[PDB]
Request: fold
Amino acid sequence: MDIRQGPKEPFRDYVDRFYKTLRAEQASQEVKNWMTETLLVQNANPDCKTILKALGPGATLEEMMTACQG
Amino acid sequence: MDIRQGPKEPFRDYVDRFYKTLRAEQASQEVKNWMTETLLVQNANPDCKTILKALGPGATLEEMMTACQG
Reply:
């Protein structure tokens, strides 16, 4: 997964790039969930990454987007 | 991904359980690589997890299995 959030890139824009790469692999729902819990958080920028980790397990993409909106 | 390595479970056995769950989603090669770099390492037991992180990026499943063999 080459996609990494730019330090000034809006979270939603990063999410779209991330999912564009995810779609190319026709990932199932379970795979999407795993990728959202791991790589989406791990590849987020310094500011957003801290916030996302502080959400705990089971946080939805929506809750992540709400947390890092801007 | 419910699969987590037991504190006394051989790494290879954990790998097989992990991949059994991965097969159920018909994950592509790219998805397998992402899962191997993230969840396989993150869900490994205390002993093996440290060793695996110390391998750095691009470490193959084979190198991981060699590192935590026993």
